[PDB]
Design a protein around this nucleic acid. Structure first.
Ligand SMILES: [Mg+2]
Lengths: 229, 427
RNA sequence: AGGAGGGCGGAGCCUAUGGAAAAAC
DNA sequence: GTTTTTCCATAGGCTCCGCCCTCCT
């Protein structure tokens, strides 16, 4: 017996019903927030409603998808100052320049990347999937660069240092470049810390304002239980 | 919160003399191989393989040959073996081709080639020639120099013994357990174009082992060839072991999502209807189309004393149709567990099925345990790839064939040669 | 290419839902 | 008069290819 953690961050509170206004789809549709396309119907939610709303509960199958996009839209407006909105869509992308001490930071811009998505299961349980990536940017042109291109542009020592620093910022390896006995736990600690910092939360539980109510997230990994059958 | 269940313990490989060894412990497996040998020791026509290289009068090459002979004779029990030696002047394709021609003319069961360095066009243009003629095993001199000779030689010898027609080990698992037939899928994207390959794996001796492989198919011809593959694989299963009925047929898809209807599901359903029309499959035949995935955003943290990783065989229930499957695990050593990078699990989703709600739990757990079991049937080395064989092998075949086609190598047509379906040249 | 794993960069694939148009029959 | 293809669209999820390293009994 034991407990497993998944990196899905549970959402323990959300409105039971939301204001949804379904309108016929059109070719001039601009895909943005507060509106979604499901077939020939465009559903308006949150601030996008136009007072012909329809109350739909979580028992409906429409609720899961509309609420997925609802969470993606709501969390996009609670980004803290050090983090910036990269791309909003099926996933919420937040980036943040790594200002911690690493060598050749004046030529190689390493930044974090929180890829945020919603996991829904059991027809009523929602959650937030946070996946972390590191973007390596060549700081003079601010354009995306790879290890081979780093070695080409700056030499072997720069490439080795940046590789070690990236794998240490992922917490997969030690800062000196070796594997170690607590890399997975450090990776989860890193994910939780960056999620808390990105959404401006100094606490485990943060609440977010939405027209239909409030959303409460736990900012902790979701426990997995052993079932015997 | 989600639930999880671990594959039942007691898993062991099967050895030549009928004994068994604990899994995940390579040293005990090598000791057991010394004691009893491989499960199926190959029978060799010439009892003599060749060592082709260009580093003549090299102590590293001599140590490589000595280790090869010692492990082939002692731990692999291919007795009365002989390793010849051929030297090409230059690493160009013409000279190595001349030397492999000489080695074949002398009469050999396999070619053990040493490439000086890394060169993709030469390697594929020459491996296409080799697989069309004889079992082969490449080495890179730079990689061989920078690696411990024992581990390197043991892994290449696992690869070569499997390529020679041997069976190093099979899972000592229940034969009345799990599906009867599996048709895995693998893909390679070349210039934004998918080339697909099918692996036909089914129970021959009660044990499930890889049997056939398919040529690369275009996405346009993917569905028709999958239909033909289902019919051919069920026919081959019935040919292999009569007195048995086809009860479960699982299909593994990688590199593409299966279509939940009007796609792979439609083709498989129609094939099953036709097959039961000829009374080839059982009336109560249960099928499933599965999606296997590694680029999911999920990470699983486990027991702190297990390096914070889940034990191998852990099945995490994401939903009723999608599962996470832990296949690796930190390995014990003479001192303790070994430091490991965080390990990403395998996403297993049931896109389509025919199961009733009453049998769902049992059937899904059966297919998950069988995916875990065929994870351990990879024969490239002592540590098995996270992918199961059914999707690992076709991916390798598709990569090799596409690379040969793009690099101008000798065409590989598995349909022409029976050994092409029946021998792991791709390992 | 002895493998196993992770990371990064680059292209994109693929599913689902709808829509139309076209050729059938 | 009557089902297949073959293109669109948005919403979502991967997924292949390289190369960079740390490890193995
Ligand atoms: Mg190989």
């Amino acid at each position: 017996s034991g407990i497993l953690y998944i990196n899905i961050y549970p959402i323990v509170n959300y409105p039971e019903t939301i204001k949804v206004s379904a309108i016929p789809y059109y070719e001039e549709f601009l895909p943005g927030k507060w509106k979604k396309r499901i077939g020939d119907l465009i559903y308006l939610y949150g601030y996008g409603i136009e007072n012909e709303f329809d109350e739909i509960d979580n028992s409906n199958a429409l609720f899961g998808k509309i609420f997925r996009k609802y969470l993606l839209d709501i969390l996009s407006e609670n980004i803290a100052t050090p983090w910036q909105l990269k791309e909003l869509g099926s996933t919420l992308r937040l980036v943040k320049e790594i200002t911690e001490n690493y060598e050749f930071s004046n030529i190689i811009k390493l930044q974090y990347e929180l890829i945020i998505n919603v996991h829904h299961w059991q027809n009523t349980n929602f959650g937030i999937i946070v996946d972390l990536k590191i973007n390596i940017l060549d700081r003079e042109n601010n354009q995306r660069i790879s290890y081979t291109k780093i070695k080409d542009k700056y030499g072997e020592s720069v490439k080795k240092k940046i590789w070690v620093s990236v794998q240490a910022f992922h917490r997969h390896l030690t800062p000196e470049g070796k594997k170690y006995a607590t890399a997975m736990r450090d990776k989860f600690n890193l994910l939780t810390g960056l999620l808390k910092e990105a959404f401006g939360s100094s606490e485990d539980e943060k609440t977010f304002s939405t027209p239909d109510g409030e959303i409460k997230i736990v900012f902790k990994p979701l426990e997995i239980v052993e079932v015997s059958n | 919160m989600m639930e999880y269940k671990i594959v039942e313990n007691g898993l062991t490989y099967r050895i030549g003399n009928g004994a068994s060894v604990p899994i995940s412990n390579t040293g005990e497996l090598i000791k057991g191989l010394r004691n009893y040998g491989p499960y199926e020791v190959p029978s060799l026509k010439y009892n003599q393989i060749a060592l082709i290289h260009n580093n003549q009068f090299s102590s590293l090459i001599n140590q490589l040959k000595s280790q090869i002979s010692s492990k082939i004779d002692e731990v692999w029990h291919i007795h009365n073996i002989n390793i010849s030696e051929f030297i090409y002047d230059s690493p160009h394709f013409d000279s190595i081709k001349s030397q492999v021609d000489n080695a074949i003319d002398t009469g050999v069961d396999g070619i053990m080639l040493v490439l000086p360095e890394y060169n993709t066009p030469l390697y594929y243009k020459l491996k296409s020639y080799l697989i069309n003629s004889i079992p082969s095993q490449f080495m890179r001199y730079d990689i061989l120099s920078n690696r411990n000779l024992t581990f390197y030689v043991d892994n290449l010898l696992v690869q070569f013994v499997s390529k020679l027609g041997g069976k190093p080990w099979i899972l000592n698992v229940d034969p009345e357990k799990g599906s009867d037939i599996i048709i895995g899928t693998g893909a390679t994207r070349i210039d934004n174009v998918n080339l697909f390959c099918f692996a036909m794996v089914f129970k021959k001796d009660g044990t499930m082992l890889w049997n056939e492989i398919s040529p690369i198919v275009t996405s346009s011809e993917y569905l028709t060839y999958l239909k033909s593959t289902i019919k051919k694989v069920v026919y081959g299963f019935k040919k292999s072991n009569p007195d048995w009925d086809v009860e479960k047929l699982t299909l593994h898809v990688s590199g593409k999502r299966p279509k939940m209807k009007d796609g792979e599901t439609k083709i498989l359903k129609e094939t099953v209807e036709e097959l039961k029309k000829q009374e080839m499959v059982s009336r109560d035949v249960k099928y499933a189309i599965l999606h296997l995935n590694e680029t999911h955003p999920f990470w699983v943290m486990g027991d702190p004393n297990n390096r914070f990783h889940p034990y191998e065989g852990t099945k995490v229930k994401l939903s009723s149709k999608r599962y996470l499957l832990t296949l690796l695990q930190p390995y014990l050593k003479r001192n303790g567990l070994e430091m490991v990078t965080p390990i990403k699990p395998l996403s297993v989703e049931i896109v389509s099925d025919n199961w009733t709600s009453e049998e769902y739990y049992h059937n899904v757990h059966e297919i998950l345990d069988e995916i875990y079991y065929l994870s351990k049937m990879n024969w490239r080395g002592f540590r098995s790839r996270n992918l199961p064989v059914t999707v690992n092998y076709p991916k390798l075949v598709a990569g090799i064939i596409a690379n040969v086609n793009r690099y101008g190598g000798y065409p590989i047509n598995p349909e022409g040669n029976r050994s092409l379906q029946t021998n792991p040249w791709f390992l």
